[PDB]
Amino acid sequence: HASAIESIETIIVDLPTINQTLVLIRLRCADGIEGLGESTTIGGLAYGNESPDSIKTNIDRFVAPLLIGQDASNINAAMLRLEQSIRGNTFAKSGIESALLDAQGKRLGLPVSELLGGRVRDALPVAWTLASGDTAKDIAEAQKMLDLRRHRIFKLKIGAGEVDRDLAHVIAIKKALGDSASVRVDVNQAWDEAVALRACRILGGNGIDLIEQPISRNNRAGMVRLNASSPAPIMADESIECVEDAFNLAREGAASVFALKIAKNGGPRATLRTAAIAEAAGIGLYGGTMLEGGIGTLASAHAFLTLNKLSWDTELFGPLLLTEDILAEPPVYRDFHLHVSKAPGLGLSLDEERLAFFRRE
Amino acid sequence: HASAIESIETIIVDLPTINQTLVLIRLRCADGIEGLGESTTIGGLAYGNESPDSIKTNIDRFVAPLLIGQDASNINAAMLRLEQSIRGNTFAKSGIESALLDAQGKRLGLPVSELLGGRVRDALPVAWTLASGDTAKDIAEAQKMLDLRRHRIFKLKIGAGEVDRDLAHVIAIKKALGDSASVRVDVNQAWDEAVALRACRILGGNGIDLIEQPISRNNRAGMVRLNASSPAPIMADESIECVEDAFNLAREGAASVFALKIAKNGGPRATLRTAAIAEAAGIGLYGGTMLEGGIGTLASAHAFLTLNKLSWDTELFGPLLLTEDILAEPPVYRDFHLHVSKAPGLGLSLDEERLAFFRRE
Ligand SMILES: [Mg+2]
Ligand SMILES: [Mg+2]
């Protein structure tokens, strides 16, 4: 009549942006406590093998049956029970663990960061992706975010256009901002090593601070070679699809910085194991996102608050892209940071009206 | 008036065995809650650079001043605060974290295993070291422990005598027990690779299931080479003196099994990070001990209860060597296992009378 998991509801929500689809998880226990989680991805199946649609399918058909009736207060046991019968599906697992953590936090009256060991900071620096595709527009937007003291670290997505044009674009943005901001790029696996070996040298010699996943996660030997030739640090993102990938990447020397995404590792706890491996290997950390709304963003944040050091900051700006979220109170952003409260669990509540209005069904 | 750390007392205790020195840590908070921890080692400075004497010295002079006044409920912050100003001293750090975990467990009314995420088992298999040095005596003792259903996994310490005599000794013990028990050896770094390369082949071909730290932790390349030539798995023990060592050993391929000792890693939490690295690398786990009494043994046990798998079992028999401990109620051993309760914290209480009688001062 207390901690037993009573029900797990998965809801697909479509929210307008400045459309983003989220998968909300509502986990309820026998004692009335409800935990909220979020499994969100980008562009259907273009950025991962799990879509919001298949996440709901697999949670409803396989995850729920395994957890209904289980003690929600033993999260390690619940997640291992899942790992025993379910391969992959890390996005789904991440949402489920987030919900369990939120519920256990409420149950003990402690924020998730404390359940995870204890925070060493209350705020996290938040970078911003400039996505207009227009050099002039990006520079203006960056200067705007700087003036409003919202962001001072900017990320540029490149790789889709002609290499020299992408490079000129990013370099022109850094040149305009100078030392007033940190400029990084994400190539999303777009380049072949033949192109990256030259492009990384150019970006590194022109003020770009970090080069995220320049080539395919499949060119394992190539990522190692690029770490040696690139004068700028390389960060692994897509190369990490589970905690074990983190170890293998560190063993091989495939990247000097690891992006930490709860969706890719299977939840905050799994993400902290990936962080532990990176730290033990002397690899830098970055708080990554799959553009989650407030729930997923805070689930990530609470884990990041416990890290000794986050040398490369975070990109937890997902909520800032939504013209409307399903939360009664959005996360707090001020002076270049995301400020995380000490409220129990994830410290957020659902706005039932907006949920009913935006839920696909 | 609640969680602030009020005092930290270190007590050196000498207990008779079937003499063992323990370093008891008594941590008291402003709310009256007391946490108990244990920093224990073997033979003064023969098995580590920290002696019970220097552990007390460094805790009193450097650790205590850093923690008095700090919030005992944020263990991650407290331990990182220590890591910022204190190099090494993992045995001392282990005792301190154990005390903090015990106190926080009492504070929340949860066993340490739950604070660490949640147990997946309530009992742990416990091996037994046969140390008579006499083949006949060891066989008789092993058969005795089997009959009493106390132990079915036996460890033999070798390396001090002539190689062929040590090998004959261990092989004769396994031959007598047959498949009724698992026989392993610990060479404690005693052999040179020149000797180990031949000895491991002999032991592996004669029923020895595991070879613990056959050579010096300093012969890094040698440990890797032995993993290839030995038909029996090699376990790293002394090679692990911090979490980072675990990563480097996994990267190099220095051992296929890792011993997990809270004293060597700096506490239950650090030990779980080492375990996470091992698991991510496909390396087997073993619950190790530095012959701690009940407190240290249970601190280790609570961490081990959370591990998905402990393929090589544990050697948590430290309390069984003491003719008397400082605990009112000793740990529970039955049917080849150590049974861990769900009592708050480490679930143990100090016998004030025995402590007063055995404390060195
Ligand atoms: Mg990326
Ligand atoms: Mg050993």
Short mmCIF file of C-alpha atoms in Angstrom, two decimals, chain A residues 144-356:
data_model
loop_
_atom_site.label_atom_id
_atom_site.label_comp_id
_atom_site.label_asym_id
_atom_site.label_seq_id
_atom_site.Cartn_x
_atom_site.Cartn_y
_atom_site.Cartn_z
CA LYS A 144 21.66 39.65 -28.26
CA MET A 145 22.05 36.68 -25.91
CA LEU A 146 25.25 38.23 -24.57
CA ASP A 147 23.55 41.58 -23.91
CA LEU A 148 20.67 39.87 -22.11
CA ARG A 149 23.25 37.86 -20.16
CA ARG A 150 21.50 34.68 -21.31
CA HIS A 151 24.33 32.87 -23.11
CA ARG A 152 28.05 33.36 -23.74
CA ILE A 153 28.86 29.96 -25.24
CA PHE A 154 27.60 29.26 -28.75
CA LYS A 155 27.33 26.08 -30.78
CA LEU A 156 27.14 25.96 -34.57
CA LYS A 157 25.84 22.95 -36.47
CA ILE A 158 27.81 22.36 -39.67
CA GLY A 159 28.56 19.57 -42.12
CA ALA A 160 25.50 19.75 -44.38
CA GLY A 161 26.92 22.40 -46.68
CA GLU A 162 30.14 22.78 -48.67
CA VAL A 163 33.02 22.43 -46.21
CA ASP A 164 34.78 25.73 -46.94
CA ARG A 165 31.48 27.63 -46.70
CA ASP A 166 30.67 26.06 -43.32
CA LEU A 167 34.15 26.88 -42.05
CA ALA A 168 33.94 30.49 -43.26
CA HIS A 169 30.55 30.78 -41.55
CA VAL A 170 31.77 29.59 -38.14
CA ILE A 171 35.07 31.48 -38.31
CA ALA A 172 33.27 34.73 -39.20
CA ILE A 173 31.01 34.32 -36.17
CA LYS A 174 33.94 33.80 -33.81
CA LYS A 175 35.83 36.71 -35.35
CA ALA A 176 32.87 39.01 -34.73
CA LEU A 177 32.43 37.90 -31.12
CA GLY A 178 36.13 37.72 -30.30
CA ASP A 179 36.92 36.79 -26.70
CA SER A 180 33.43 37.82 -25.58
CA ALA A 181 32.25 34.26 -26.17
CA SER A 182 33.24 30.63 -26.68
CA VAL A 183 32.35 29.23 -30.10
CA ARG A 184 32.05 25.48 -30.71
CA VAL A 185 30.80 23.34 -33.58
CA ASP A 186 28.88 20.10 -33.92
CA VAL A 187 29.34 18.25 -37.21
CA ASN A 188 26.87 15.49 -36.30
CA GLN A 189 29.05 12.80 -37.95
CA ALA A 190 28.74 14.59 -41.31
CA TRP A 191 32.38 14.64 -42.45
CA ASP A 192 34.60 11.88 -43.84
CA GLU A 193 38.00 11.69 -42.12
CA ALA A 194 39.52 12.96 -45.40
CA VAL A 195 37.66 16.24 -44.92
CA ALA A 196 37.88 16.43 -41.12
CA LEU A 197 41.66 16.08 -40.99
CA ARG A 198 41.95 19.41 -42.81
CA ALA A 199 38.86 21.16 -41.41
CA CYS A 200 39.76 20.51 -37.77
CA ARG A 201 43.15 22.15 -38.29
CA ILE A 202 41.48 25.21 -39.83
CA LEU A 203 38.87 25.58 -37.07
CA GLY A 204 41.45 25.04 -34.35
CA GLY A 205 43.69 27.71 -35.82
CA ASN A 206 40.77 30.13 -35.95
CA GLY A 207 39.40 30.27 -32.42
CA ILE A 208 36.93 27.38 -32.40
CA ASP A 209 37.13 25.81 -28.92
CA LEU A 210 35.61 22.38 -29.48
CA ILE A 211 34.75 20.11 -32.41
CA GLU A 212 31.87 17.76 -31.63
CA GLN A 213 31.64 14.39 -33.41
CA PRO A 214 33.30 15.44 -36.70
CA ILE A 215 33.02 12.00 -38.30
CA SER A 216 30.97 8.81 -38.13
CA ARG A 217 30.99 6.85 -34.88
CA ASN A 218 31.76 3.89 -37.18
CA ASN A 219 35.19 5.22 -38.15
CA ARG A 220 36.68 4.20 -34.81
CA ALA A 221 40.31 4.30 -35.93
CA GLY A 222 39.67 7.65 -37.61
CA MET A 223 38.39 9.37 -34.49
CA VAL A 224 41.60 8.32 -32.73
CA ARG A 225 43.74 9.65 -35.58
CA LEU A 226 41.87 12.98 -35.60
CA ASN A 227 42.53 13.47 -31.88
CA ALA A 228 46.23 13.52 -32.76
CA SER A 229 46.04 15.83 -35.78
CA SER A 230 43.42 18.26 -34.48
CA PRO A 231 44.83 21.25 -32.53
CA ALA A 232 41.31 21.66 -31.11
CA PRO A 233 39.76 19.10 -28.73
CA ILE A 234 37.31 16.57 -30.21
CA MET A 235 34.12 15.67 -28.31
CA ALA A 236 32.29 12.36 -28.68
CA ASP A 237 28.48 12.49 -28.83
CA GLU A 238 26.90 9.99 -31.24
CA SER A 239 29.84 7.66 -30.54
CA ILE A 240 28.32 7.14 -27.09
CA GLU A 241 25.16 5.00 -27.24
CA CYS A 242 25.71 3.19 -23.92
CA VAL A 243 28.01 3.28 -20.90
CA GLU A 244 30.24 0.59 -22.43
CA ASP A 245 30.86 2.77 -25.48
CA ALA A 246 32.29 5.36 -23.10
CA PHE A 247 34.85 2.89 -21.80
CA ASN A 248 35.84 1.72 -25.27
CA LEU A 249 36.21 5.30 -26.52
CA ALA A 250 38.43 6.16 -23.54
CA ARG A 251 40.46 2.98 -24.05
CA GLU A 252 41.06 3.79 -27.72
CA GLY A 253 41.61 7.51 -27.21
CA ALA A 254 38.75 8.51 -29.54
CA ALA A 255 37.92 11.86 -27.89
CA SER A 256 39.24 14.14 -25.15
CA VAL A 257 35.74 15.30 -24.12
CA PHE A 258 32.51 13.29 -23.74
CA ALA A 259 29.00 14.67 -24.14
CA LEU A 260 26.74 13.33 -21.37
CA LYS A 261 23.15 12.67 -22.47
CA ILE A 262 20.76 10.77 -20.22
CA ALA A 263 18.80 9.61 -23.28
CA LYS A 264 21.89 7.95 -24.82
CA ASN A 265 23.02 6.20 -21.63
CA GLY A 266 19.66 5.16 -20.23
CA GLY A 267 18.99 7.67 -17.47
CA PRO A 268 20.75 9.96 -14.95
CA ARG A 269 22.33 7.04 -13.07
CA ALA A 270 23.79 5.37 -16.17
CA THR A 271 25.00 8.79 -17.30
CA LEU A 272 26.90 9.23 -14.03
CA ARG A 273 28.65 5.91 -14.62
CA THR A 274 29.69 7.19 -18.05
CA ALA A 275 30.94 10.35 -16.31
CA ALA A 276 32.87 8.22 -13.80
CA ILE A 277 34.62 6.40 -16.64
CA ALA A 278 35.46 9.66 -18.38
CA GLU A 279 36.81 11.23 -15.18
CA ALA A 280 38.94 8.16 -14.43
CA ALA A 281 40.40 8.47 -17.94
CA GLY A 282 41.09 12.20 -17.66
CA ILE A 283 38.41 13.00 -20.24
CA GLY A 284 36.48 16.28 -20.00
CA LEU A 285 32.72 16.46 -19.46
CA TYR A 286 29.88 18.29 -21.21
CA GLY A 287 26.21 18.30 -20.23
CA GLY A 288 24.38 17.34 -23.40
CA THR A 289 20.75 17.37 -24.47
CA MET A 290 18.39 15.79 -27.01
CA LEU A 291 16.33 19.00 -26.75
CA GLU A 292 14.22 17.75 -23.86
CA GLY A 293 11.57 19.96 -22.30
CA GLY A 294 11.66 20.97 -18.64
CA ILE A 295 11.32 17.47 -17.22
CA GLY A 296 14.13 15.84 -19.17
CA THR A 297 16.28 18.95 -18.86
CA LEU A 298 16.00 18.98 -15.07
CA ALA A 299 16.51 15.21 -14.85
CA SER A 300 19.79 15.82 -16.67
CA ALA A 301 20.63 18.90 -14.59
CA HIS A 302 20.21 17.13 -11.25
CA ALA A 303 22.77 14.54 -12.31
CA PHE A 304 25.16 17.23 -13.56
CA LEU A 305 24.98 19.12 -10.25
CA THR A 306 26.83 16.20 -8.61
CA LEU A 307 29.83 16.20 -10.95
CA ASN A 308 33.11 17.45 -9.50
CA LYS A 309 33.80 19.29 -12.73
CA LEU A 310 32.01 20.04 -16.02
CA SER A 311 34.93 21.59 -17.90
CA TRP A 312 32.98 22.16 -21.09
CA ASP A 313 29.70 23.38 -19.59
CA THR A 314 26.25 22.30 -20.86
CA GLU A 315 23.70 22.79 -23.64
CA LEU A 316 20.60 22.44 -21.45
CA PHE A 317 18.56 24.98 -23.41
CA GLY A 318 15.84 22.63 -24.63
CA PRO A 319 13.01 24.36 -22.69
CA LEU A 320 14.00 27.70 -24.24
CA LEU A 321 12.99 26.46 -27.69
CA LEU A 322 9.38 25.78 -26.68
CA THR A 323 6.82 28.57 -27.05
CA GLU A 324 4.87 26.52 -24.49
CA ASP A 325 5.73 23.54 -22.24
CA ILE A 326 3.50 21.23 -20.20
CA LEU A 327 5.00 22.44 -16.93
CA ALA A 328 3.23 24.85 -14.60
CA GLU A 329 6.55 26.54 -13.85
CA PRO A 330 9.44 26.45 -16.38
CA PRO A 331 13.12 25.99 -15.43
CA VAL A 332 14.95 29.13 -14.27
CA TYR A 333 17.53 30.69 -16.60
CA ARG A 334 19.49 33.74 -15.51
CA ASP A 335 22.95 35.22 -15.99
CA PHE A 336 24.32 32.56 -18.36
CA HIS A 337 23.08 29.70 -16.15
CA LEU A 338 20.23 27.29 -15.47
CA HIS A 339 19.44 27.53 -11.75
CA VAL A 340 18.30 24.30 -10.14
CA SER A 341 16.21 24.43 -6.97
CA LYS A 342 16.36 22.12 -3.98
CA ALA A 343 12.70 21.15 -4.28
CA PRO A 344 11.88 17.44 -3.78
CA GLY A 345 12.33 15.20 -6.82
CA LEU A 346 12.73 17.14 -10.07
CA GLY A 347 10.93 20.10 -8.50
CA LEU A 348 8.36 20.54 -11.24
CA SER A 349 4.63 20.10 -11.68
CA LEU A 350 2.44 19.29 -14.64
CA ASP A 351 0.04 21.90 -16.00
CA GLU A 352 -2.89 19.54 -16.56
CA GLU A 353 -4.68 21.98 -18.87
CA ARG A 354 -1.75 22.44 -21.26
CA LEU A 355 -1.05 18.70 -21.20
CA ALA A 356 -4.63 17.94 -22.19
#
